[PDB]
Amino acid sequence: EVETFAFQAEIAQLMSLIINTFYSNKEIFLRELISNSSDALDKIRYESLTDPSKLDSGKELHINLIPNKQDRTLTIVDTGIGMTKADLINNLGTIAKSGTKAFMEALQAGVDISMIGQFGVGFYSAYLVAEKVTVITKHNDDEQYAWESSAGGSFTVRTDTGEPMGRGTKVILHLKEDQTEYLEERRIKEIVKKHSQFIGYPITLFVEKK
Amino acid sequence: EVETFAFQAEIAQLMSLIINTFYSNKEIFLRELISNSSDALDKIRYESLTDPSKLDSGKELHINLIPNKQDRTLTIVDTGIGMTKADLINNLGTIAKSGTKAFMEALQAGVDISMIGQFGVGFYSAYLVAEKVTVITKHNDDEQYAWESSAGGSFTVRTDTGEPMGRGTKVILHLKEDQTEYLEERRIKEIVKKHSQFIGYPITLFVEK
Numbered sequence: 001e002v003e004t005f006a007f008q009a010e011i012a013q014l015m016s017l018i019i020n021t022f023y024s025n026k027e028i029f030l031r032e033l034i035s036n037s038s039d040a041l042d043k044i045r046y047e048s049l050t051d052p053s054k055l056d057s058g059k060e061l062h063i064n065l066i067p068n069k070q071d072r073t074l075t076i077v078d079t080g081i082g083m084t085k086a087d088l089i090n091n092l093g094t095i096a097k098s099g100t101k102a103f104m105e106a107l108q109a110g111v112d113i114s115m116i117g118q119f120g121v122g123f124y125s126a127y128l129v130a131e132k133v134t135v136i137t138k139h140n141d142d143e144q145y146a147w148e149s150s151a152g153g154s155f156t157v158r159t160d161t162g163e164p165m166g167r168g169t170k171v172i173l174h175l176k177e178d179q180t181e182y183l184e185e186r187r188i189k190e191i192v193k194k195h196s197q198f199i200g201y202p203i204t205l206f207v208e209k210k
Numbered sequence: 211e212v213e214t215f216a217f218q219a220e221i222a223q224l225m226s227l228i229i230n231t232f233y234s235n236k237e238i239f240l241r242e243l244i245s246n247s248s249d250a251l252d253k254i255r256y257e258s259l260t261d262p263s264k265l266d267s268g269k270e271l272h273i274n275l276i277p278n279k280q281d282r283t284l285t286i287v288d289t290g291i292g293m294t295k296a297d298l299i300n301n302l303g304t305i306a307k308s309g310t311k312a313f314m315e316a317l318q319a320g321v322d323i324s325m326i327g328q329f330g331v332g333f334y335s336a337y338l339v340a341e342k343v344t345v346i347t348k349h350n351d352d353e354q355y356a357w358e359s360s361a362g363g364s365f366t367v368r369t370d371t372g373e374p375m376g377r378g379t380k381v382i383l384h385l386k387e388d389q390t391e392y393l394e395e396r397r398i399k400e401i402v403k404k405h406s407q408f409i410g411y412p413i414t415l416f417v418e419k
């Protein structure tokens with residue numbers, strides 16, 4: 001059974017902005033996804049400090065980047081805390097964070113789209129390069145879920161039937177036809193090496209089985 | 211009343227570096243404290259989307275800067291998720307351990323102190339301008355506490371007796387004698403415009419006199 005939700009009106013607007021504004025520095029999407037992964041990973045390590053059983057679903061804390069030229073997909077996998085169904089639905093579409101209006105405001109007052117992260121809504125920068133985004137997520141308290149959207153004002157949520165994850169969040173970017181550079185080894189390294197924040201977790205870039 | 215604790219050795223080490231190294235660009239401390247406040251406010255906002263009862267202790271998500279020239283203090287107050295007693299003593303230091311060590315290594319490879327916030331330990335940049343820092347905090351599940359340190363390798367924690375803050379964290383900088391410029395209204399505005407122009411939450415600069 002697949003459920004369909006409307007994006008909150010301001011979020012639909014943020015997404016349209018992102019998809020339609022001319023902006024050449026698209027590579028910031030990767031930075032924003034890795035920061036989310038970093039926060040999710042901090043969170044599960046933090047909870048494990050007082051309750052070590054939370055790592056029963058997987059004790060390795062890391063980030064994998066997986067390009068697939070055949071599928072034209074770039075996938076980012078982490079083993080952070082993950083999202084329950086309620087987290088998925090509430091944090092990823094149906095409720096506008098105050099940073100959305102604030103961000104869009106800032107754009108009028110002379111900011112760059114690359115600062116989307118300061119406003120807690122960096123995730124939507126994925127649509128700089130992706131025509132469709134699928135998010136698979138597993139939290140300790142819930143079942144494994146699949147979120148999906150090609151924008152257009154709605155997203156769907158279903159129970160995921162694919163390979164279980166143990167715990168964490170996996171972001172599958174279905175790349176636009178002219179954005180395949182982000183499947184190239186040399187390009188991905190370049191963007192990650194440029195990453196401002198010290199990532200306190202191993203980032204492994206997978207090689208394609210060409 | 212008051213309990214005294216030893217810093218993690220790497221944090222002690224980082225703190226002596228910050229205090230003893232020659233570095234004129236001290237103003238970056240504000241940017242780092244304002245970044246922490248923003249992160250803290252992200253955390254309670256995130257939690258509140260699924261459990262709105264988390265804002266019972268306070269709906270307003272914002273940051274105050276309060277200079278006091280009588281006391282020679284600069285105070286950064288926010289209404290974020292706040293910190294528990296275990297967070298003050300142990301948890302936060304343990305999470306930041308890998309960044310702390312990584313930062314110190316980076317400095318040896320000739321990087322700049324202003325990069326401190328990139329390694330998740332921007333708070334300790336407070337000791338660029340302060341001889342003593344007092345942190346008052348309130349988390350939803352816990353009581354209100356005072357953390358304190360003048361470096362020298364130790365810190366204290368006590369239950370705070372003062373004004374109940376509801377939820378959040380207040381960082382009181384007791385400024386060095388030669389660092390009073392950061393009490394000046396023009397100077398603070400300048401530094402906020404320069405390094406923190408687009409923060410995701412309102413910031414109110416208090417005026418004096």
Ligand SMILES: CCOc1ncc2c(n1)CCN(C(=O)c1cc(C(C)C)c(O)cc1O)C2
Binds near residue numbers: 036081
């Ligand atoms: C504010 C800190 O507290 C906190 N608690 C839980 C979580 C977070 N932060 C961050 C997000 N998160 C995830 O699972 C996650 C989500 C995204 C995109 C938004 C889809 C991503 O690209 C990678 C991820 O690991 C869970």
Ligand SMILES: CCOc1ncc2c(n1)CCN(C(=O)c1cc(C(C)C)c(O)cc1O)C2
Binds near residue numbers: 345
């Ligand atoms: C997920 C576990 O990691 C975690 N959880 C909660 C918090 C944090 N990290 C840091 C932020 N925070 C605060 O209270 C705070 C702290 C500082 C300085 C560090 C002293 C500051 O200058 C302003 C603040 O609001 C809350």
